Each structure stands twice: as structure tokens, then as C-alpha cells.
Amino acid sequence: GPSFWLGNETLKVPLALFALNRQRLCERLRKNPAVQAGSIVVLQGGEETQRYCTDTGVLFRQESFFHWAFGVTEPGCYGVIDVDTGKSTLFVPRLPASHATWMGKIHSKEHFKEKYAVDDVQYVDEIASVLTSQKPSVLLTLRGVNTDSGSVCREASFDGISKFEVNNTILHPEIVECRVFKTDMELEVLRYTNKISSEAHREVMKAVKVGMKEYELESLFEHYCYSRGGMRHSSYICGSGENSAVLHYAPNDRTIQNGDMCLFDMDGEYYCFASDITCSFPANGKFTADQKAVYEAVLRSSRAVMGAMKPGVWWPDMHRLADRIHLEELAHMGILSGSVDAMVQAHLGAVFMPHGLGHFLGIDVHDVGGYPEGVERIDEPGLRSLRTARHLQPGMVLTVEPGIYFIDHLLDEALADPARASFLNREVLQRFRGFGGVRIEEDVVVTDSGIELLTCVPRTVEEIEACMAGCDKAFT
Amino acid sequence: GPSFWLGNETLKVPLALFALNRQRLCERLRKNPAVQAGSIVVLQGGEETQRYCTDTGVLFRQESFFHWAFGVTEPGCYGVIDVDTGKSTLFVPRLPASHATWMGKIHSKEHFKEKYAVDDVQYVDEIASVLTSQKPSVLLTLRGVNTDSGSVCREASFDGISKFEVNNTILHPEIVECRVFKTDMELEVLRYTNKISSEAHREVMKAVKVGMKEYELESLFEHYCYSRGGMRHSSYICGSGSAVLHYGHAGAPNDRTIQNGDMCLFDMDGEYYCFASDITCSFPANGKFTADQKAVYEAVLRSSRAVMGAMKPGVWWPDMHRLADRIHLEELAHMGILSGSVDAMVQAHLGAVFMPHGLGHFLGIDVHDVGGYPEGVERIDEPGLRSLRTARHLQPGMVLTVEPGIYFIDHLLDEALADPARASFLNREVLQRFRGFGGVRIEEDVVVTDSGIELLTCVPRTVEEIEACMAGCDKAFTP
Ligand code: PRO
Numbered sequence: 001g002p003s004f005w006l007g008n009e010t011l012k013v014p015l016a017l018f019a020l021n022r023q024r025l026c027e028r029l030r031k032n033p034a035v036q037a038g039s040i041v042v043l044q045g046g047e048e049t050q051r052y053c054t055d056t057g058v059l060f061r062q063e064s065f066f067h068w069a070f071g072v073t074e075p076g077c078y079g080v081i082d083v084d085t086g087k088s089t090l091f092v093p094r095l096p097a098s099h100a101t102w103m104g105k106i107h108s109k110e111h112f113k114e115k116y117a118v119d120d121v122q123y124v125d126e127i128a129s130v131l132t133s134q135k136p137s138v139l140l141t142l143r144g145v146n147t148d149s150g151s152v153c154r155e156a157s158f159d160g161i162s163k164f165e166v167n168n169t170i171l172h173p174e175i176v177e178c179r180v181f182k183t184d185m186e187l188e189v190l191r192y193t194n195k196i197s198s199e200a201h202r203e204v205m206k207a208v209k210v211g212m213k214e215y216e217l218e219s220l221f222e223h224y225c226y227s228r229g230g231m232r233h234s235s236y237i238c239g240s241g242e243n244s245a246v247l248h249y250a251p252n253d254r255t256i257q258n259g260d261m262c263l264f265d266m267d268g269e270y271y272c273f274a275s276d277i278t279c280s281f282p283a284n285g286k287f288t289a290d291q292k293a294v295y296e297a298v299l300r301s302s303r304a305v306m307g308a309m310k311p312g313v314w315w316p317d318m319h320r321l322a323d324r325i326h327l328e329e330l331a332h333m334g335i336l337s338g339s340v341d342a343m344v345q346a347h348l349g350a351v352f353m354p355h356g357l358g359h360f361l362g363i364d365v366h367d368v369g370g371y372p373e374g375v376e377r378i379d380e381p382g383l384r385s386l387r388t389a390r391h392l393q394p395g396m397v398l399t400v401e402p403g404i405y406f407i408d409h410l411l412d413e414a415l416a417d418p419a420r421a422s423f424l425n426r427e428v429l430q431r432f433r434g435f436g437g438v439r440i441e442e443d444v445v446v447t448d449s450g451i452e453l454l455t456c457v458p459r460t461v462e463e464i465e466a467c468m469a470g471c472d473k474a475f476t
Numbered sequence: 477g478p479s480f481w482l483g484n485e486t487l488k489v490p491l492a493l494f495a496l497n498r499q500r501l502c503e504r505l506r507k508n509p510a511v512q513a514g515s516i517v518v519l520q521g522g523e524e525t526q527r528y529c530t531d532t533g534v535l536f537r538q539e540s541f542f543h544w545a546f547g548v549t550e551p552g553c554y555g556v557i558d559v560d561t562g563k564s565t566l567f568v569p570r571l572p573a574s575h576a577t578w579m580g581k582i583h584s585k586e587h588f589k590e591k592y593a594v595d596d597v598q599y600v601d602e603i604a605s606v607l608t609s610q611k612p613s614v615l616l617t618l619r620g621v622n623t624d625s626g627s628v629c630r631e632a633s634f635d636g637i638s639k640f641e642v643n644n645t646i647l648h649p650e651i652v653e654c655r656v657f658k659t660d661m662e663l664e665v666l667r668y669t670n671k672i673s674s675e676a677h678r679e680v681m682k683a684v685k686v687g688m689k690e691y692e693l694e695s696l697f698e699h700y701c702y703s704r705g706g707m708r709h710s711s712y713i714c715g716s717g718s719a720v721l722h723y724g725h726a727g728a729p730n731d732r733t734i735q736n737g738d739m740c741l742f743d744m745d746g747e748y749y750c751f752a753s754d755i756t757c758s759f760p761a762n763g764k765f766t767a768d769q770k771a772v773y774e775a776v777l778r779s780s781r782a783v784m785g786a787m788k789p790g791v792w793w794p795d796m797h798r799l800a801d802r803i804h805l806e807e808l809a810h811m812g813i814l815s816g817s818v819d820a821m822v823q824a825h826l827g828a829v830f831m832p833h834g835l836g837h838f839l840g841i842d843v844h845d846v847g848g849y850p851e852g853v854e855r856i857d858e859p860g861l862r863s864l865r866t867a868r869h870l871q872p873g874m875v876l877t878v879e880p881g882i883y884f885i886d887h888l889l890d891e892a893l894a895d896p897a898r899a900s901f902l903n904r905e906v907l908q909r910f911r912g913f914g915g916v917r918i919e920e921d922v923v924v925t926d927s928g929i930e931l932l933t934c935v936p937r938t939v940e941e942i943e944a945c946m947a948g949c950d951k952a953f954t955p
């Protein structure tokens with residue numbers, strides 16, 4: 001069958017991937033006792049947008065649920081799926097002849113049917129008539145709350161939809177749940193995005209020089225991923241010095257200084273499939289003793305979490321595991337003193353890692369389904385920032401991204417709190433003010449017995465220093 | 477005073493640039509008989525947006541009028557200008573403490589005042605109180621129609637604005653007219669964006685190889701402009717012999733393989749600190765012009781240079797478009813593609829078959845800049861000319877693109893061959909050879925001076941210059 005491809009060495013993605021997703025969605029809806037026979041899923045694709053009142057185009061990127069179901073790159077489409085039969089119909093714009101002059105050839109409906117391997121193709125201005133002739137019981141539209149943005153998914157609408165019975169509650173939790181579990185075809189794409197991104201991160205480590213601007217590295221990274229991978233930046237983090245303390249840190253215009261710890265967090269996507277990797281490393285290519293200690297603490301928690309991950313593991317337990325390891329290591333360094341058990345009970349870990357350990361990844365970098373009905377957010381420091389509190393199951397894709405930061409306002413808050421202040425050694429901590437931070441982010445897939453690591457970048461102090469010194473890769 | 481700067485070799489842009497724009501706007505409004513004493517200009521800046529219902533951020537880019545007046549890069553601001561005194565007040569978001577953790581340092585209001593060289597800074601949630609205490613007569617807000625998009629400009633609004641008298645008609649044409657005429661400080665930025673982009677175009681010509689994907693050149697171009705210039709792609713064109721055909725939108729990767737014998741047409745735009753550039757280079761994929769390629773290319777070079785040589789204050793822009801048409805038709809006849817009277821070809825609008833777009837457009841903070849069709853200036857309802865983005869007379873301070881081209885577009889050629897009024901001009905036996913040629917476009921950015929133009933762009937343009945550039949010759953080499 002047909003595939004998406006940007007030539008050269010880029011990945012061929014079979015359109016069969018999206019056919020399988022439609023099948024899986026129907027199979028799930030059929031088991032839902034509230035779903036009526038004769039229901040049709042109706043999804044509306046994204047449209048081209050312009051900046052404010054200008055004719056300046058914003059780069060078009062397909063809406064994620066619609067992409068998941070159909071893999072369609074063109075703006076202005078709809079897609080429907082007959083739940084009982086699984087039959088797919090794509091609706092495309094009826095374009096005018098002037099489109100031939102400055103946009104391009106006007107493809108036939110046949111062309112799109114073959115391109116996307118759907119059962120039928122019709123024009124958008126005919127959607128109400130086509131759906132009417134199919135005599136559906138109910139139209140299932142998409143509406144629900146994204147638990148990272150807090151935004152409400154926008155329901156499909158078309159001229160004449162008011163004449164149909166519409167249900168906007170059933171679909172969202174079901175299609176979200178399908179997205180949580182990646183198919184083998186989906187995993188192939190995520191392996192690819194991780195491969196390209198990993199290569200780009202290596203090139204960044206090889207290229208960094210004291211005196212460069214952060215955005216020079218962003219530029220190189222993006223150039224590698226686009227020219228070699230057919231990939232683009234996903235969500236709009238190259239922090240050197242105390243900017244590495246800033247989690248989501250426009251062009252990053254800080255000059256990389258000698259002695260800085262760089263924290264390079266980029267994401268990217270191929271055909272709307274994401275990757276999210278973070279590398280930390282000394283700007284000048286040589287870890288100081290302090291940098292090595294902080295860095296190896298995060299390497300330890302990173303590897304402890306990956307090693308412990310398997311089906312049945314509760315994700316908040318992994319977050320707490322990283323906290324405990326960080327506190328142990330900060331104590332070994334002399335930054336902390338006292339009982340680590342007591343430190344954990346006082347939530348001291350969150351002073352140094354205020355964000356969640358990691359998140360679902362897929363078509364969105366912060367992928368859907370972290371907090372389905374019945375799964376609650378934990379109202380404690382650190383944990384409340386987790387983007388899921390679910391138990392792990394095979395097929396889930398997660399980032400594992402512990403970090404340690406020295407953030408003045410969190411440190412000062414702890415120092416003012418008698419329940420936490422006694423753990424902190426001001427005279428040692430003073431040395432780490434302005435250190436910035438370290439974050440190590442891997443992408444992994446949960447397997448039947450553990451995980452599969454998708455990411456492949458230098459991680460040990462030795463590996464990183466060798467990479468940055470320009471040593472041939474084969475060098476040990 | 478303070479400046480915007482991205483370090484290294486990038487341009488330092490004084491915030492005085494924006495102060496001058498505010499002063500110029502106030503000076504214009506003070507001369508406007510309908511403007512009430514005590515009026516204040518109220519502009520609302522852009523806000524951060526996310527992809528659909530996700531938390532995936534869209535790259536923030538400031539709204540153009542707001543940028544023109546204030547140069548503010550932060551989302552969620554407002555800006556006001558007292559017309560009678562010129563006093564400026566920037567309103568910035570009151571950020572929560574968690575911002576220190578996730579975004580960066582929470583800057584003071586004094587920090588922003590110093591950064592932007594405005595007279596006062598307040599928090600956005602205090603705008604109604606602050607304006608009430610200043611007792612303005614009228615709030616002048618922004619509403620009007622962009623004549624390229626057809627969209628209506630979004631008026632500023634804030635909770636409590638209903639308690640003020642608001643006029644939304646006066647401001648738009650006046651601030652548009654200010655933007656049409658670039659200051660000396662604005663021209664320095666446009667010279668810079670043209671310099672970086674010109675350098676990037678040279679690198680593309682130097683790097684291109686048969687067998688590459690078009691998007692590989694786009695990537696290289698964008699990397700040069702960003703890493704060396706601090707610039708970003710502006711509006712979402714690397715055509716050989718594909719992005720819209722294969723994926724449905726220009727922003728998609730152009731994934732056509734560049735073939736031996738292809739004519740490349742490389743049209744990119746970009747911006748530095750929201751100031752645009754828009755340049756197009758055409759060149760043979762394999763670095764050697766064929767006779768046919770030389771002939772078509774030199775035809776467009778002739779019209780480019782004829783228009784640039786003719787441009788000066790008082791010239792009617794549509795006359796320049798017609799001049800380019802006539803030259804294209806003359807040269808296509810000299811090639812044997814056309815035959816007969818060029819006077820007759822023009823009367824039959826044959827030029828639009830080969831150049832269906834406008835000769836060029838205003839450029840500034842937007843690539844297709846504002847003010848091309850103010851009230852009283854009409855769009856010409858003829859092929860080609862109806863696509864012009866302005867029908868104004870040229871005056872000093874305007875910045876325009878000059879981008880004639882010749883294309884071989886099957887459905888336009890076929891229409892002409894089926895039209896008895898046009899068909900007899902075309903020689904099918906020669907034209908058939910140019911089916912699939914693609915096209916040539918040569919786009920320069922220029923400033924209208926007191927007596928002519930200043931060319932902003934600096935790329936190889938003659939056949940010899942282009943072949944030398946593609947052969948890896950130093951810039952300073954002149955063949
Ligand atoms: O947003 C998140 O959850 C992670 C934390 C560090 C940056 N990205």
C-alpha cells in the first residue's frame with residue numbers, strides 16, 4: 001500500500017498505520033454500552049491560518065486526533081468513520097482553477113482515495129448530504145478536556161449538522177485511550193524520530209564552543225533534523241548557565257560561557273510523530289567535580305527509573321524514586337544533611353525537581369490520556385506537576401526526565417521553613433547558587449517485562465567528554 | 477540608549493526606532509482635524525497561542541502594528557500613547573511566582589521601562605484604573621481591512637473599556653500611512669535583513685547539487701539566516717522544474733528531487749526582529765545555463781533592470797507592471813515563442829499568461845506590507861494587474877519588491893491557445909520545447925529615494941555572476 005515519505009534516508013510510513021488506528025477505535029466503540037448501532041464518528045481537520053489580520057501564513061500542522069485517524073496533511077478536510085462497518089470517508093475541499101496557478105495541480109477525489117487508502121472520498125460541501133444518505137443514528141463528535149493545557153477539544157461542525165443527532169461525550173475518552181497505546185507501526189516512527197534527534201544532539205555536543213549563542217545550537221539541531229530527517233520543531237529549550245535552571249526557557253540569546261553547564265532540551269516531529277530528548281553537558285567539554293556529582297546523580301535516577309519500569313508500576317512511585325535518589329546524592333555531596341526518610345516526608349525532593357518525572361509521548365509531545373476519569377492528580381510538591389498518575393502498561397510511550405536544579409526562590413522558601421531548613425547546609429549550597437541544573441531525558445516504550453529505550457545519545461561523563469573533544473565515535 | 481541585539485554579527489536595533497515611530501504617529505494625529513484633544517492611542521499586543529486543544533506552543537511573533545509602535549517581544553502586553561504629549565505607557569502581564577521556575581526571572585516594571593525606553597510601565601490588570609485616572613477624552617483603537625488578506629484588524633479591548641469613549645475609525649489609515657514610509661532607522665534594519673538573506677541565497681547557489689531534495693536547500697537557507705543572522709522564516713518557495721502538490725500547503729516540505737537540466741526558482745522570506753526581507757533567485761540546477769535557460773532568464777533580467785531604472789517618485793506602479801509585461805512579450809517574440817505585433821499582444825493581455833502575479837509589493841514589518849490600497853486607490857480589473865498589491869504612485873521612503881517573472885503554466889497557455897484573440901500569437905512548435913521549463917523570477921528589494929531607488933539586495937544576477945557563484949568563486953570576484 002501507499003506510504004508517506006520525504007525521500008533520501010527518511011522513513012516510509014505506511015498509510016496502513018492510520019487504517020489500523022481507525023479499526024482499533026471502532027473496536028473500542030463497539031464495546032461501549034452507550035454506543036448506538038449506526039453511529040458515525042465525525043472529525044474535522046485543521047485549516048490554514050494567518051498571523052493576526054495579515055496574509056502571512058502560519059506553518060500548517062494537522063490537528064492531532066484527525067492525524068491519528070487519517071494521516072491527512074491537507075488543510076480543510078473532514079473525516080468520518082462508520083462505527084459498525086469501519087468504513088472510512090475523507091472529505092476534501094473542492095478547489096478553484098486559480099489554485100492551479102499559484103498553489104498547484106488540482107487532484108481528483110480518486111487521487112486522494114488512493115493516497116490515503118480510505119474507502120471513499122467526497123467534497124466538503126457535500127458532507128451533510130452524504131451523511132444524510134447514510135441515515136446514521138448519531139454523529140459522535142470530539143469534545144473533552146486536555147489535562148495539560150486545560151483546553152476543551154473543539155467539536156466538528158458543518159453546515160447542516162444541526163439536523164443530526166449529535167453526541168459529544170462518548171468519543172473523546174475512547175479515542176484518547178487508543179492513542180495511549182502505540183501500535184507496532186507507530187513505534188517504528190517513534191524509533192525513527194528518536195534516531196534522527198539523537199544524531200542531532202550528538203552533532204550539537206560536537207559543535208558547541210564557548211562564546212556561541214544558544215540559538216546557534218538550536219539552529220544546527222533544526223537543520224540536521226530537517227535536512228537529514230525531514231523533521232521540524234514541535235513545540236515552542238537551550239539553556240546555558242543559570243538558564244538551565246529555567247525549565248521551559250524567541251531566540252535563546254545567552255552567550256555560552258566557560259564553566260557553564262548546558263541543558264539542551266529540544267523536541268521535533270516527523271509526520272506529526274514526536275520525539276523529546278534532553279542532554280546536559282559542560283560548555284567547555286570538561287566536567288568539574290561539582291558538575292560531575294550533580295550530573296551523575298541525575299544519571300543514577302534516570303537509570304534507576306528506566307530499570308524499574310515495567311507493567312504494573314505506578315508512575316508516581318517512579319517520581320518518588322528519583323526524588324529519593326537525588327536527595328541521597330545531594331546528601332553525599334554535603335549539600336544536605338540528616339535522614340533522607342525525613343527529607344522525603346518533608347517533600348524536599350521537589351525543591352530540586354519541581355516538575356514531573358516524565359510524560360506520555362506520541363503525536364503530541366505532551367501526549368493525551370495521562371488523567372482519564374478515575375485517575376487523580378496528587379496534590380503534593382513535584383507530584384502535582386506529573387502529567388500522568390497512571391500505572392504502566394505495555395505499549396505506553398513515556399519520557400524519563402529527572403533533573404536537579406538550583407532555583408533561588410525554591411531554595412529560599414525551604415530555608416525559611418523550619419521543617420526543611422535543617423536539612424540544608426547553606427555554606428555548601430552557596431557554592432551551587434547559579435549552577436543552573438541538569439536534566440537527562442530519554443524516550444522509552446513499556447514492554448511486557450520492562451522497557452525499550454528509543455533514545456541513543458552519549459550519557460556517561462566519559463562518553464560525553466569524548467564526544468565533545470571530537471574523538472572518533474569508535475574511540476573508547 | 478538601549479538596543480535589541482542577538483550578539484555576534486547581528487544588528488543592534490536601537491529602541492529609539494520605535495520611539496520615533498510613536499513620535500511620527502502623534503505628529504500625524506495632531507494634524508488630523510478630527511482628533512480630539514486628550515486622545516490616547518490604545519494598542520493590544522499578541523498573546524501566546526497553542527496548537528488546537530494541546531499545550532503545544534506556537535512560536536510567538538508580535539502583532540505588526542504593536543511591534544511598529546513599541547518593539548515589544550513579550551506576549552500579553554498593551555501599549556498606549558497620549559497623542560498630545562507623546563507619553564508612552566506599556567502594560568505588561570502580572571506574572572505568578574511559578575513563572576520563576578518554568579519561564580525565567582520575573583522582571584520588574586522598571587526593568588521593562590528601561591528595556592523599552594517608554595515613559596511608564598504598569599500591569600495589564602490595572603489598565604482600566606490607570607486610564608481612568610488619566611482622564612482621556614477618547615480612546616483611539618485599531619480597526620480596518622488588510623487588503624491582501626481581507627481580514628479585519630482586531631481592536632484593543634480590556635475589561636472596563638465600555639466606560640470610555642472609543643473611536644475605531646481614525647487610527648488605522650493614519651498608522652498604516654506611517655508604516656508605508658520607512659524611517660532611516662527602519663531602513664538600517666531592512667538593509668541588514670537583505671544582507672543576511674542575500675548571503676544565504678549565495679550559500680544555496682554554492683551548495684545546490686543535482687539529486688538533492690528542494691527542502692534540503694530550504695533547510696540550509698534557514699540555518700544560515702538563523703545561526704548567522706538571528707533571523708526566522710516569515711511567511712509559510714523552493715521550486716524545481718511541490719510542497720502544495722504532495723502535501724497541500726506551501727509550508728510543507730518541498731520534496732521534489734532536483735534534476736539535471738532543471739531551472740531552480742528559490743523564493744524565500746525571513747525577518748529580523750519582525751522586519752522582513754523577500755528575495756528570489758533563479759538558477760540552473762547543474763550550474764550551467766542552457767541557451768533556452770539563458771534566453772528566458774535574461775528576459776526577466778531585462779525587465780527587472782528596466783523597472784529599477786525607471787522607478788522614481790511620481791511613477792504609477794501599474795505602469796511599471798505594464799512595462800515588465802511589454803518587455804517579456806518583446807523578448808519572448810525575440811525567442812520565437814511568440815510572433816506578431818507586441819502592441820497587439822499587450823492589447824490582448826498576453827503578458828498575464830506568462831506573469832499572472834503582480835510585479836511587486838510594499839515590504840516592511842509584514843512581507844506583504846500594509847497600505848497598498850488606501851481609500852481612493854482602486855484595484856485594476858485586468859489579468860495580471862488585478863494581482864498587484866498596490867496601485868499607488870511611488871513616493872520617497874516606500875520599500876517595494878521588484879519581482880517580474882516568466883513562467884510556462886500549462887492551463888494558462890492552453891487557455892490562450894483556445895482563445896482566438898490570443899492563440900495566433902503563440903508558436904506551438906517553439907513553445908512545445910518550453911513546456912515543463914518551469915519559470916524564472918528575479919526578486920529585488922528596493923527603497924524609493926528622492927530621485928530613484930536604492931537597491932537593498934546583493935546577489936549574483938547576470939548569467940556569468942550566477943555561474944561563478946555556483947562554481948564556488950569568492951564574492952569579491954566579478955566576471
Ligand atoms: O513539561 C514537562 O513536563 C517537562 C519538564 C521539563 C521540561 N519538560
Ligand code: PRO
Binds near residue numbers: 834
Ligand atoms: O505574492 C506575491 O505577490 C508574490 C508573487 C510571487 C510570489 N510572491
Ligand SMILES: [Mn+2]
Binds near residue numbers: 276359399401
Ligand atoms: Mn519532555
Ligand SMILES: [Mn+2]
Binds near residue numbers: 754837877879919
Ligand atoms: Mn515577494
Ligand code: NA
Binds near residue numbers: 265276277278441
Ligand atoms: Na522535556
Ligand code: NA
Binds near residue numbers: 743755756879
Ligand atoms: Na516573492
